[PDB]
Amino acid sequence: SETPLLDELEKGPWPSFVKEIKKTAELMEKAAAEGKDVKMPKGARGLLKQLEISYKDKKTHWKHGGIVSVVGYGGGVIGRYSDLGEQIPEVEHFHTMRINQPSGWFYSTKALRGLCDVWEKWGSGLTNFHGSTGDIIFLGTRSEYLQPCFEDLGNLEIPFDIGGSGSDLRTPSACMGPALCEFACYDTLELCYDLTMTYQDELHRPMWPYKFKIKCAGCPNDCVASKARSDFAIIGTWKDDIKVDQEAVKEYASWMDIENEVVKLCPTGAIKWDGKELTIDNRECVRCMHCINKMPKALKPGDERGATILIGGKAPFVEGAVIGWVAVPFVEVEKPYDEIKEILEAIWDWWDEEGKFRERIGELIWRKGMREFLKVIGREADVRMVKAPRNNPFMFFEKDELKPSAYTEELKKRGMW
């Protein structure tokens, strides 16, 4: 075999990424011999080869990239160059094009085929369904093909635009939300779409200190992992009683251990069951879902719905990994979402003014204080923002809180206040 190490990973029950690469080379190469117009017939076969050499070396053979893009945009394409390009010229340039996915990754077969027709003409044939931000990954093409590839995408019966990369608003994503799910507290797919469209300029033309990501989750289970992988996590919640079908409960009681599997596991004792009737104190509840999760035919999120905004989620660099924290306890989520847009635009203005090179929004707030962040978004301090008050007394006071004094007087006559 040409690939003895990777051939090992065609064995075994789990579907093999190696067979996908080989299937692409076989069938791309076979498309080209038949005189179909395919620009990169050897690319998936150079990728395999380079990858086998990487397996033997236990190291990457990709080197830092030049900047590359389509006409009129500043991000969406990651330039990638092989260090093996003379030995394997078909992968000398092998850039990725991120293609913005439909909200919650819903497709019709007509939409997928146009994508497959476009990528087969201009690229390697390899794709990721999906990149971790959410985009479709068009993996591997040359610089000269990026522009005509994008022109074909925009001209398709069902057209697709480029997603984000670099110091921009990244491609927003959303959980399935109300398309499939009975726990959804707002229209996740509609909001995602609307944000994508409102801020096309922000996404396509990086202008900011660094990247900014938004993800929308329908409910607190967070099935898009927003609090950890977006700076601005929008997470469905509710303000009023959990809705209880009491008949449906007894149907559950006839077989489920409700005491142990439900009652006992509520974080706050919110929910007592006495053999004939189920009670929720909703004032104790914290909407952690679990009981709803446990009894979906009987229990439902309350009627007065909205979102909680958690701020600052990010991977570690530089100042450490972040699960985002409470910025806005409750905001309403209805089209055209002006309250959310208002909050976003304020954050962006402040961040573009005060942020350092490569400073994330979470880091800027750690540096400036939540007091300044809250003044920026026009909201007040709220106990739900913290998990405990401060364990030290080194507090800053606003000038206007201090008593008028001889000392406040000397501070002005010394020009320091």
Partner: protein
């Protein structure tokens, strides 16, 4: 005319199944029928079957087409992916569900599974979220696709059935950038370096902007060297994070003998039961041993088996440690605690520990 730009993705409502578009936002309940199969019942009476299959995330365009022929046959031309890169089909005729599962299994070799059921308390292991590795990335410590495949091979039986007592997510990052919710997984595989950079002065002078390269080091280990207009590294402060190489081609730190993976555990995203949590390191290092990474795979299976044998229903890994304490954790997993596992990452502030990183709060 000019070329079209700024038009965004296709509007999703036009790519929804008519029965999905009709009942949008008007569901009664969902019921997990068997591994891979979720029945969804609308207010109107409509019943739809969501059938879920695992994929290698990296798909041939020829594979996506075949998935297209299948969705035309069984789901009226409609399909979706989940936020773990499963793929999902919608079947209105319950009689054709097993026909579908058997046709995908045959034509593309994807397996039906990846679901869990909180109602009964029985959980499958779903797909592993992961990155490019050696396939595309310039900064990896480990491969992602090779390792996911090696691990999924060993734990296959947990994807096609509901045999675990709680959710368990497994995620992989090929370097300390993460590129996923890998820092908040029940088990996380994270690529590391264990060697400092060797500054290459010619490359630094040519291509690196010095002040931002220096500001990217979390420990202050880098200083400008004005004399030779380069950067000097103090090795006693370096912990091989790699962030200086992301910024600067002249700071490589890769060593194929000493690059490898840390195994972290105990992250949680969801709020149910217990607040969300960052994962924690329990195995400092395992080497890269392509194509099958036996050492890394063995430790992953060892941690999974130990939790699954002692976990009560609904008690995920961090919840299990919540109950037993870390002393028992290390004992029952047969893992060693060493000084490496003692946090020394200084730059992160204590006050973050006091911010509510959770949607759990009372009105």
């Amino acid at each position: 005319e000019g070329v079209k730009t700024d038009f965004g993705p296709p509007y999703f409502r036009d790519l929804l199944h008519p029965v999905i578009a009709k009942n949008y936002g008007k569901w009664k309940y969902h019921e997990v029928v068997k591994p891979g199969v979720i029945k969804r019942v609308a207010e109107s009476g409509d019943v739809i079957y969501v059938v879920r299959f695992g994929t290698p995330r990296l798909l041939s365009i020829y594979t996506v087409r075949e998935l297209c022929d299948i969705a035309d046959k069984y789901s009226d031309g409609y399909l979706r992916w989940t936020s773990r890169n499963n793929v999902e089909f919608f079947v209105t005729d319950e009689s054709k569900i097993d026909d579908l599962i058997n046709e995908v299994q045959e034509r593309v070799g994807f397996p039906c599974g990846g679901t869990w059921d909180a109602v009964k308390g029985e959980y499958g292991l779903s797909n592993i979220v992961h990155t490019q590795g050696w396939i595309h990335c310039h900064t990896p410590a480990i491969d992602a696709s090779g390792i996911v495949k090696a691990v999924m091979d060993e734990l296959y039986e947990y994807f096609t059935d509901h045999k675990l007592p709680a959710m368990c997510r497994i995620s992989l990052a090929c370097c300390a950038n993460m590129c996923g919710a890998v820092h908040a997984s029940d088990i996380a595989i994270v690529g590391i370096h264990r060697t400092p950079p060797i500054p290459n002065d010619e490359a630094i002078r040519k291509t690196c902007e010095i002040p931002s390269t220096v500001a990217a080091c979390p420990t202050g280990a880098l200083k400008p060297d004005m004399k030779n207009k380069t950067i000097k590294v103090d090795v006693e402060k370096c912990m091989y994070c790699g962030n200086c190489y992301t910024m600067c081609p002249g700071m490589p730190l890769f060593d194929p003998e000493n690059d490898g993976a840390a195994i972290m555990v105990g992250g949680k995203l969801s709020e149910a039961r217990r607040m969300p949590e960052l994962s924690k390191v329990v195995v400092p290092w395992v080497p890269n041993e392509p194509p099958r990474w036996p050492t890394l795979v063995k430790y992953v299976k060892q941690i999974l088996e130990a939790w699954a044998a002692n976990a009560n229903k609904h008690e995920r890994l961090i919840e299990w440690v919540d109950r037993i304490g870390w002393e028992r954790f290390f004992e029952l997993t047969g893992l060693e605690f060493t000084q490496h596992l003692i946090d020394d990452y200084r730059i992160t502030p204590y006050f973050y520990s006091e911010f509510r990183a959770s949607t759990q709060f009372k009105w």
